[PDB]
Design a protein around this ligand. Sequence first.
Ligand SMILES: *[C@@H]1O[C@H](CO)[C@@H](O)[C@H](O)[C@H]1NC(C)=O
Lengths: 49, 39
Amino acid sequence: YFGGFNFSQILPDPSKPSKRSFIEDLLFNKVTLADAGFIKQYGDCLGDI
Amino acid sequence: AGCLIGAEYVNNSYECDIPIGAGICASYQTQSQSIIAYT
Ligand SMILES: *[C@@H]1O[C@H](CO)[C@@H](O)[C@H](O)[C@H]1NC(C)=O
């Protein structure tokens, strides 16, 4: 309760293991990535699929 | 960021000293005197 102001859509939602809000989830889902190599991908590059 | 040989992980948290990768930092601490890695 913050005087009737609703902050539940920008405060974190701890239901998921990444403590992110709803609007932050939309922002992270809308920006599509090029799948950069910041996570290792040598095993996937070795296995020719 | 790959894997690290020669530094032992600790279940603590300090300020970053040597940045390694995705949240992992390394330092030269006493827990003897050796290189440790942490979050
Ligand atoms: C805040 O908004 C959400 C969705 O817009 C709603 O589910 C929630 O009940 C609201 N909070 C309060 C205290 O009514």
